[PDB]
């Protein structure tokens, strides 16, 4: 039996590219992911799982952007951000991404929710 | 925003007293408990979240029965075990404890879902 990740989705995040990452994990890497996220940036599902984030990240990358998010997340607040990205072809679009802390019912960080808008 | 941690349950854990334990944490302790569970065992929230769910056992319960839910737990595969439990009062109850492996979509082990059924 698998856990039902979306269920923890906001109704804004449905039709979105959405991931969800698991910040106790070493490199806080991504547990789910959206087929959104998949198809806007090219990716399999092997290709990502297990994986930060990071790898959306690329040469013209504004690396304080990418310092902003760290502290973000060390912060455990909402925020959103917007940062260069790529797909697996290369191509870039500049990404609105918004990221939120989840807690467990004792009130420790469970996961982080972070949703991706290409902005146009 | 806290997780909704209930809405991984199945149907017939609804009404029940149910917990979910989590294992990548010393020494997998309960992250969420229903309301049935803090009403049968007679604890409060407070008293149960972050701990072991051993402290139901007591005197009188099987030390085979605990190594039993042991191994099941190490096997990560679905077990009911007859073992008997007792609430704060120190009142005692078998329980007919169903636990079953949760999974994220790497396939990773996740979370443990227990069910608790006094026997009659
Ligand atoms: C839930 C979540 C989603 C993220 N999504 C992106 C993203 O879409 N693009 C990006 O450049 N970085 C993203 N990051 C940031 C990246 O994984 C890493 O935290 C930063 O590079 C700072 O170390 C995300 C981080 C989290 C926790
Ligand atoms: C999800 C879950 C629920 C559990 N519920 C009970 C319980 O109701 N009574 C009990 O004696 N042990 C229970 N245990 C077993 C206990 O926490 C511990 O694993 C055993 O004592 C073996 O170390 C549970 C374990 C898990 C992972």
Same mark, same amino acid.
């Given at each position: 039996?698998?856990?039902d990740?979306?269920?923890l ?8 590219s ?19 996220? +998949?198809?806007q940036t090219?990716?399999?599902?092997e *290709? ?7 790898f959306? $990240?690329? #040469? ?6 990418v310092?902003?998010?760290r ?5 455990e ?6 940062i ?12 609105? +991404? ?5 807690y467990?019912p *004792? ?8 949703? $991706?808008? #290409?902005?146009?």
């Amino acid at each position: 039996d698998i856990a039902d990740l979306r269920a923890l989705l906001d109704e804004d995040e449905a039709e979105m590219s959405v991931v969800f990452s698991d910040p106790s994990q070493p490199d806080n890497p991504m547990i789910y992911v959206s087929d959104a996220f +998949l198809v806007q940036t090219g990716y399999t599902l092997e *290709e990502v799982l297990g994986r930060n984030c990071r790898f959306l $990240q690329g #040469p013209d990358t504004n690396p304080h952007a990418v310092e902003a998010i760290r502290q973000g997340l060390k912060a455990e607040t909402r925020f959103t951000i917007d940062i260069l990205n790529y797909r697996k072809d290369g191509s870039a679009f500049v990404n609105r +991404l918004r990221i939120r802390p989840i807690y467990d019912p *004792e009130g420790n960080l469970m996961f982080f929710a972070g949703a $991706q808008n #290409p902005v146009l």
